[PDB]
Amino acid sequence: MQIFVKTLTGKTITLEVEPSDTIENVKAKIQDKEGIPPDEQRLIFAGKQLEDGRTLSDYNIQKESTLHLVLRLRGG
């Protein structure tokens, strides 16, 4: 199924996902498209920060849901 991820600057990222995917799998898909390491990604649905080990099903994230991506870089 398709979900959408909106970036801070308002670009859309379309993903193909399954309800059974973990948030970590979603971040891996975002890394495939945008090159962002997962540790530096935060995903938000309906105001909730999504935990990497939980599933899309855990959050009732259905087809055509929009998630918001926020980046938090490592210190260096």
Q: Which lies closer to Mg ion via its Cβ, residue 41 or residue 55?
A: 41
Residue 66 interface partner, choices K ion, Mg ion, Na ion, none, CB cut-off 5-8 Å depending on type: K ion
Contact by Cβ (8 Å): 71, 42:
yes
Q: How far apart are CA 30 and CA 36, in angstroms?
A: 7
Candidate ranges 5-13, 28-36, 40-48, 61-69; the one touching K ion (CB under 5 A): 61-69
Q: How far apart are CA 66 and CA 73, in angstroms?
A: 23
Residue 62 interface partner, choices K ion, Mg ion, Na ion, none, CB cut-off 5-8 Å depending on type: none
Q: Which lies closer to Na ion via its Cβ, residue 9 or residue 14?
A: 14
C-alpha dihedral over 76, 54, 24, 3, to 10 degrees?
-120
Question: Is 74 a residue that touches Mg ion (CB under 5 A)?
Answer: yes
Give the interface with Mg ion as residue ranges (CB under 5 A). 74-76
